[PDB]
Amino acid sequence: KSSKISEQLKCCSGILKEMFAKKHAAYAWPFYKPVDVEALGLHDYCDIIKHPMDMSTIKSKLESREYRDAQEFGADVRLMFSNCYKYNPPDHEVVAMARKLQDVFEMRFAKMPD
Amino acid sequence: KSSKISEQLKCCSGILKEMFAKKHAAYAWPFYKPVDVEALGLHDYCDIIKHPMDMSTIKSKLESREYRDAQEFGADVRLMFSNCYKYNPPDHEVVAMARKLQDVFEMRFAKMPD
Ligand SMILES: [Cl-]
Ligand SMILES: [Cl-]
Ligand SMILES: [Cl-]
Ligand SMILES: [Cl-]
């Protein structure tokens, strides 16, 4: 009942690897690294988003064993997406990209064995 | 720091109400009530889905104050969607419907004040 935790965390690494792969690069790229809050237009980002998250941070957290289980991993992925939905206008091209990427994540995360 | 919990749970009720509304009825209807495991084709449902969830159950749980916070509410909504993604073939019409409905949920849940 904890070797399963180890195998699910292994799947999580596999999911994140696919999210980084060329296959999804057309819509994943806004999520690879932390939002650059120094960029023009992002002067209010930290006002609105209390807990920023991105795929490289998630990768480092997996590697530093900072997730107790797959559920904690999934919470950070969903936090990343919700940050995008919260901050941006609903017709923003980046929201559509988040949706395509969340598609990949939800399907893989759901089909993960337990 | 707990009157906010009360207001977020109020928003959750509002989100679920919208999910039940005519506006989304074309794709929400598979999710209104528990999956009927007596129906033809569903003889393996309980084998695959250890924790069934649906919108009417979520509604009753809100009303019976069974969610400590919005995060617990959101977990049951996401459990409902992941159950659909886990059980069904990825090209199944119901998966597409879950996606449209999860669209509604994620956008509202993200824009909820805190
Ligand atoms: Cl610029
Ligand atoms: Cl700016
Ligand atoms: Cl029949
Ligand atoms: Cl059957």
Side-chain angles (χ1 to χ4, degrees), chain A residues 2-114, chain B residues 2-114:
Chain A
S2 184
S3 142
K4 232 284 154 286
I5 287 155
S6 155
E7 179 51 57
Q8 287 213 322
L9 285 164
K10 197 161 332 212
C11 284
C12 291
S13 171
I15 291 165
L16 192 75
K17 184 195 176 129
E18 181 179 342
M19 295 166 63
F20 269 116
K22 170 56 164 114
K23 175 175 172 110
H24 305 296
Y27 43 93
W29 67 263
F31 311 102
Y32 288 171
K33 285 183 145 9
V35 164
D36 179 2
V37 295
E38 302 312 315
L40 183 66
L42 291 161
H43 53 94
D44 56 354
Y45 193 80
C46 306
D47 285 352
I48 292 154
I49 290 87
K50 197 182 136 190
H51 306 283
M53 189 48 56
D54 67 282
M55 292 165 50
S56 290
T57 296
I58 294 172
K59 180 153 175 240
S60 307
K61 282 180 68 169
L62 277 165
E63 273 157 11
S64 289
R65 301 191 156 223
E66 199 158 330
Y67 299 120
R68 284 195 296 170
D69 53 37
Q71 294 64 46
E72 301 191 348
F73 163 88
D76 264 359
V77 182
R78 297 203 179 104
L79 167 60
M80 176 178 81
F81 290 131
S82 297
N83 285 343
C84 180
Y85 309 138
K86 188 184 180 165
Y87 178 68
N88 297 282
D91 59 356
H92 197 295
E93 71 184 302
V94 75
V95 171
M97 290 174 262
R99 279 188 196 121
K100 289 169 178 173
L101 190 58
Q102 184 163 18
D103 280 353
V104 174
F105 164 75
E106 294 294 342
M107 181 67 277
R108 293 298 196 188
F109 197 62
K111 289 269 173 72
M112 177 174 64
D114 58 31
Chain B
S2 184
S3 142
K4 232 284 154 286
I5 287 155
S6 155
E7 179 51 57
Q8 287 213 322
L9 285 164
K10 197 161 332 212
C11 284
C12 291
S13 171
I15 291 165
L16 192 75
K17 184 195 176 129
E18 181 179 342
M19 295 166 63
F20 269 116
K22 170 56 164 114
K23 175 175 172 110
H24 305 296
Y27 43 93
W29 67 263
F31 311 102
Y32 288 171
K33 285 183 145 9
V35 164
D36 179 2
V37 295
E38 302 312 315
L40 183 66
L42 291 161
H43 53 94
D44 56 354
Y45 193 80
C46 306
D47 285 352
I48 292 154
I49 290 87
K50 197 182 136 190
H51 306 283
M53 189 48 56
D54 67 282
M55 292 165 50
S56 290
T57 296
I58 294 172
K59 180 153 175 240
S60 307
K61 282 180 68 169
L62 277 165
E63 273 157 11
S64 289
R65 301 191 156 223
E66 199 158 330
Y67 299 120
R68 284 195 296 170
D69 53 37
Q71 294 64 46
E72 301 191 348
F73 163 88
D76 264 359
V77 182
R78 297 203 179 104
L79 167 60
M80 176 178 81
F81 290 131
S82 297
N83 285 343
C84 180
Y85 309 138
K86 188 184 180 165
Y87 178 68
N88 297 282
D91 59 356
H92 197 295
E93 71 184 302
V94 75
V95 171
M97 290 174 262
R99 279 188 196 121
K100 289 169 178 173
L101 190 58
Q102 184 163 18
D103 280 353
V104 174
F105 164 75
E106 294 294 342
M107 181 67 277
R108 293 298 196 188
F109 197 62
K111 289 269 173 72
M112 177 174 64
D114 58 31

